[PDB]
């Protein structure tokens, strides 16, 4: 985790398909679960933004796919609430594959990426083409 500095909205459970925005050769990643989450009876693990997610690669090359990888989820289709009463909402849901350290796999992340993520892991903001 880290410092998120946003009021939470989550609404991506297990089985979700998210786009891979970094060059890596994996076209789709599917979320298994959310890292550092405590789940309860009848409640699928829900994912916000900024989270370190454990995932499998659902589509890609055979060298990327049936691999269990970690990623950090940059964007989500769902609306996000800032602390200041202004809301963030991106046209799609995306994740970038990321090593557990915080350091991104791919040599460029394209589009905006969430500010809450930037705070939490520096290298993802540093690489980013823009931080919205």
């Amino acid at each position: 985790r880290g410092v998120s500095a946003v009021r939470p909205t989550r609404a991506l459970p297990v089985g979700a398909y998210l786009t891979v925005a970094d060059n890596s050769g994996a076209k789709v990643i599917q979320i298994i679960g959310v890292v550092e989450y405590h789940g309860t009876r009848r409640r699928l693990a829900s994912a916000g933004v900024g989270d370190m997610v454990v995932a499998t690669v659902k589509k890609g090359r055979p060298d990327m796919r049936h691999q269990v990888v970690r990623a950090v989820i940059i964007r989500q289709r769902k609306e996000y609430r800032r602390l200041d009463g202004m809301r963030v909402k991106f046209e799609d849901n995306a994740a970038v594959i990321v090593t557990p350290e915080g350091v991104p796999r791919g040599t460029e992340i394209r589009g905006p990426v969430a500010r809450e993520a930037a705070e939490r892991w520096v290298r993802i903001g540093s690489i980013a083409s823009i931080i919205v």
Binding site: R87, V88, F90, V132
Partner: protein
């Protein structure tokens, strides 16, 4: 911060701590006043073409006047 803002779908005066910012895949941002304004952009309608848009009307009437 003390921010103030202005809708980019009508030009109408617009309150802060209210509305949604819809952020492009490229990163640009568009300020929507209310749910109607957002719903209407998706439709691809011309708020100008219609008369529910108060500032758009207004301009045209004035442009008439000159």
């Amino acid at each position: 911060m003390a921010r103030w803002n202005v809708c980019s779908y009508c030009g109408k005066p617009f309150e802060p701590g209210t509305g949604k910012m819809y952020v492009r895949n490229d990163g640009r941002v568009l300020f929507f006043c209310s749910r109607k304004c957002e719903r209407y952009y998706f439709m691809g309608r011309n708020p100008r073409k219609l008369k529910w848009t108060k500032a758009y009307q207004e301009a045209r009437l004035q442009r008439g006047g000159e």
